Design an enzyme around this catalytic site. Structure first.
Site, PDB file in Angstrom:
ATOM      1  N   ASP A  99       1.279  -1.326   0.089  1.00 39.06           N
ATOM      2  CA  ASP A  99       0.137  -0.246   0.508  1.00 39.06           C
ATOM      3  C   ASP A  99       1.029   0.998   0.126  1.00 39.06           C
ATOM      4  O   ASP A  99       0.357   3.030  -0.148  1.00 39.06           O
ATOM      5  CB  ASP A  99      -1.608   0.119   1.080  1.00 39.06           C
ATOM      6  N   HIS A 141       1.121   8.937   9.455  1.00 39.16           N
ATOM      7  CA  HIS A 141       2.130   7.872  10.041  1.00 39.16           C
ATOM      8  C   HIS A 141       3.309   7.558   9.153  1.00 39.16           C
ATOM      9  O   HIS A 141       3.562   6.172  10.105  1.00 39.16           O
ATOM     10  CB  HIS A 141       0.925   6.409   8.869  1.00 39.16           C
ATOM     11  N   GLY A 149       0.967   3.507   5.507  1.00 41.35           N
ATOM     12  CA  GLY A 149      -0.547   3.981   5.304  1.00 41.35           C
ATOM     13  C   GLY A 149      -0.394   5.410   4.425  1.00 41.35           C
ATOM     14  O   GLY A 149      -1.043   6.209   4.431  1.00 41.35           O
ATOM     15  N   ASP A 178      -7.894  13.412  11.816  1.00 47.77           N
ATOM     16  CA  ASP A 178      -8.494  11.960  11.189  1.00 47.77           C
ATOM     17  C   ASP A 178      -8.894  10.727  11.414  1.00 47.77           C
ATOM     18  O   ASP A 178      -8.873  10.093  12.741  1.00 47.77           O
ATOM     19  CB  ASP A 178      -7.157  12.005  11.036  1.00 47.77           C
ATOM     20  N   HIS A 180      -8.420   7.806  11.173  1.00 47.77           N
ATOM     21  CA  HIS A 180      -7.431   7.388  12.269  1.00 47.77           C
ATOM     22  C   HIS A 180      -6.423   7.191  12.538  1.00 47.77           C
ATOM     23  O   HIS A 180      -6.279   9.164  13.359  1.00 47.77           O
ATOM     24  CB  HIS A 180      -6.020   6.959  10.534  1.00 47.77           C
ATOM     25  N   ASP A 269     -11.378  11.927   6.116  1.00 47.59           N
ATOM     26  CA  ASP A 269     -11.803  10.604   5.957  1.00 47.59           C
ATOM     27  C   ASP A 269     -13.202  10.159   7.330  1.00 47.59           C
ATOM     28  O   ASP A 269     -13.876   8.604   7.481  1.00 47.59           O
ATOM     29  CB  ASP A 269     -11.250   9.691   6.092  1.00 47.59           C
ATOM     30  N   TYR A 313     -11.302  10.096   0.626  1.00 46.43           N
ATOM     31  CA  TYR A 313     -10.672   9.554  -0.692  1.00 46.43           C
ATOM     32  C   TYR A 313     -12.091   9.717  -0.866  1.00 46.43           C
ATOM     33  O   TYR A 313     -12.031   9.498  -2.525  1.00 46.43           O
ATOM     34  CB  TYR A 313     -10.921   8.195   0.517  1.00 46.43           C
TER      35      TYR A 313
HETATM   36  C1  LIG Z   1       0.594  -8.252   2.763  1.00 46.84           C
HETATM   37  N1  LIG Z   1      -0.198  -6.743   1.960  1.00 46.84           N
HETATM   38  C2  LIG Z   1      -0.462  -7.235   0.242  1.00 46.84           C
HETATM   39  C3  LIG Z   1      -0.882  -5.818   2.729  1.00 46.84           C
HETATM   40  C4  LIG Z   1      -0.516  -5.922   4.056  1.00 46.84           C
HETATM   41  C5  LIG Z   1      -1.168  -4.876   4.446  1.00 46.84           C
HETATM   42  C6  LIG Z   1      -2.396  -4.469   4.348  1.00 46.84           C
HETATM   43  C7  LIG Z   1      -3.300  -2.722   5.005  1.00 46.84           C
HETATM   44  O1  LIG Z   1      -2.448  -3.145   6.280  1.00 46.84           O
HETATM   45  N2  LIG Z   1      -3.680  -1.295   4.583  1.00 46.84           N
HETATM   46  C8  LIG Z   1      -4.405  -0.536   5.100  1.00 46.84           C
HETATM   47  C9  LIG Z   1      -3.994   0.741   4.840  1.00 46.84           C
HETATM   48  C10 LIG Z   1      -4.357   1.846   5.125  1.00 46.84           C
HETATM   49  C11 LIG Z   1      -4.049   2.850   5.540  1.00 46.84           C
HETATM   50  C12 LIG Z   1      -5.379   4.330   6.022  1.00 46.84           C
HETATM   51  C13 LIG Z   1      -4.545   5.719   5.391  1.00 46.84           C
HETATM   52  C14 LIG Z   1      -5.387   7.120   6.567  1.00 46.84           C
HETATM   53  O2  LIG Z   1      -5.985   7.395   5.816  1.00 46.84           O
HETATM   54  N3  LIG Z   1      -5.231   7.356   7.738  1.00 46.84           N
HETATM   55  O3  LIG Z   1      -5.419   8.619   7.396  1.00 46.84           O
HETATM   56  C15 LIG Z   1      -2.960  -3.936   2.810  1.00 46.84           C
HETATM   57  C16 LIG Z   1      -1.793  -4.861   2.083  1.00 46.84           C
HETATM   58  K   LIG Z   2      -6.976  11.012  14.396  1.00 51.81           K
HETATM   59 ZN   LIG Z   3      -7.347   8.385   8.052  1.00 52.14          ZN
END
Ligand SMILES: CN(C)c1ccc(C(=O)NCCCCCCC(=O)NO)cc1
Ligand SMILES: [K+]
Ligand SMILES: [Zn+2]
Ligand SMILES: CN(C)c1ccc(C(=O)NCCCCCCC(=O)NO)cc1
Ligand SMILES: [K+]
Length: 399
Positions: A99, A141, A149, A178, A180, A269, A313
């Protein structure tokens, strides 16, 4: 004045990521369509005298090896040949995969947010601006040697480090709105009592990043004990309940900490229309948007403040919210009424606001008391450890 970070190259770089696409352009163009640009002071992003000066700035938080890897990842994504197995292992060692992938402008994109947020901190320090907004920043993050993230470089940590180190007793209050948990910033200042962090967010099993909740409730360590505040909330919260949950906490933090600067991450978000579909906040300004309630409250303190972006998003809805935050900031700082038409004005991106073309987002709108008691005790413990004097009853009554 109220400052805002923008520039031609800055816009091109902020619009160069595969995740955020042209979001920054929609935000800035909507602010421009509403004729807010002449009311604001443009803050130019910081540029450096040499590669060594740039590395000195970024490595105030990030490791040299991580910065070197991020630069290499950009170089490799600027060639047609795939990565070697060794380069793939190197990138995996810094979480520059999955990601947080590479792309042709990954380093220039990540660094641009840092350039904007450091310039915004400089504008506050020299007193040119009372508030500075950076809708291209707020990447909460990223860690010392790890992308996380969709965040590659932590512009917030670097901006706060510039604010805290501006005096030869400076205290900064960081508020993260946020959806998160603001883990990267909380971690960066875990051992520092001079930077108090406060994140309100959703937390639930398997929800990213998994922190900012019961683990016991950790709250800083060493001389930073009790300096990291968190308020995890269940899914579906509306504007009024989120406002009542954070309002007394914000007011109490300001009274006890007496911050020299406030830094606010305003990730969009939490909006009811964000594809996460977790919280039910709006951008309504008559219920009243939780975001607008929080920003209006923080600005009422008359403390120099940095307002940053972050998640969000649903691009047209994030532009709708941040345009309202920008107009409110002008009204609160200057005392100059900013009348915003409920109809989106014609501009380059008008078609993205269809089919209704309205400024309001298209939406029809005991656990917290326990958190309030816990936070109140933590604030008392923070004040006692740090020998700060405040009226306990004045603070108890806010809740
Ligand atoms: C091994 N593999 C294919 C993966 C492993 C972990 C993730 C994941 O946690 N994704 C979640 C990320 C979300 C981030 C949120 C960002 C945000 O809006 N922060 O404020 C994905 C794929
Ligand atoms: K927050
Ligand atoms: Zn967020
Ligand atoms: C550093 N910082 C964040 C600030 C600095 C100065 C002011 C201010 O004096 N503003 C004067 C006008 C107040 C606007 C509110 C009036 C109102 O709501 N009337 O109904 C504000 C914030
Ligand atoms: K801290």
């Amino acid at each position: 004045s109220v400052g805002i970070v923008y520039g031609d190259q800055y816009r091109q770089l902020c619009c160069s990521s595969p995740k955020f696409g042209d979001r920054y352009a929609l935000v800035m163009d909507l602010i421009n369509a509403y004729k807010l640009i002449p009311e604001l002071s443009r803050v130019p992003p910081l540029q450096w005298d040499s590669p060594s000066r740039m590395y000195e700035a970024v490595t105030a938080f990030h490791s040299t090896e991580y910065v070197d890897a991020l630069k290499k990842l950009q170089m490799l994504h600027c060639e047609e040949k795939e990565l070697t197995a060794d380069d793939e292992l190197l990138m995996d060692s810094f979480s520059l995969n999955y990601d947080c992938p590479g792309f042709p402008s990954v380093f220039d994109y990540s660094l641009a947010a840092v350039q904007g947020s450091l310039a915004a901190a400089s504008a506050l320090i020299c007193r040119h601006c009372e508030v500075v907004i950076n809708w291209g920043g707020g990447w909460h993050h990223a860690k010392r040697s790890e992308a996380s993230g969709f965040c590659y470089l932590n512009d917030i940590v670097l901006a706060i480090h510039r604010l805290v180190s501006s005096t030869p007793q400076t205290r900064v209050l960081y508020v993260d709105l946020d959806l998160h948990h603001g883990d990267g910033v909380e971690e960066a200042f875990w051992y520092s009592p001079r930077v108090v962090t406060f994140s309100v967010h959703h937390a639930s099993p398997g929800f990213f990043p998994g922190t900012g909740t019961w683990n016991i409730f950790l709250n800083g360590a060493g001389r930073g004990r009790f300096s990291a505040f968190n308020l995890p909330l269940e899914e579906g919260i509306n504007d009024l309940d989120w406002s009542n949950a954070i309002g007394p906490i914000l007011d109490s933090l300001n009274i006890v900490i007496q911050p020299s600067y406030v830094v606010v991450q305003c990730g969009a978000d939490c909006l009811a229309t964000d594809p996460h579909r977790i919280f039910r906040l709006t951008n309504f300004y008559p219920s009243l948007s939780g975001y607008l309630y929080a920003i209006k409250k923080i600005l009422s303190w008359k403390v120099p403040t940095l307002i940053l972006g972050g998640g969000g998003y649903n691009f047209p809805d994030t532009a709708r919210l941040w345009t309202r935050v920008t107009a409110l900031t002008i009204e609160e700082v200057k005392g100059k009424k900013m009348t915003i038409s409920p109809e989106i004005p014609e501009h380059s991106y008008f078609s993205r606001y269809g089919p209704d073309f309205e400024l309001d987002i298209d939406y029809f709108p005991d656990s917290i008391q326990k958190h309030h008691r816990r936070i109140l005790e933590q604030l008392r413990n923070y004040a006692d450890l740090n020998k700060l004097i405040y009226d306990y009853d004045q603070v108890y009554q806010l809740y």
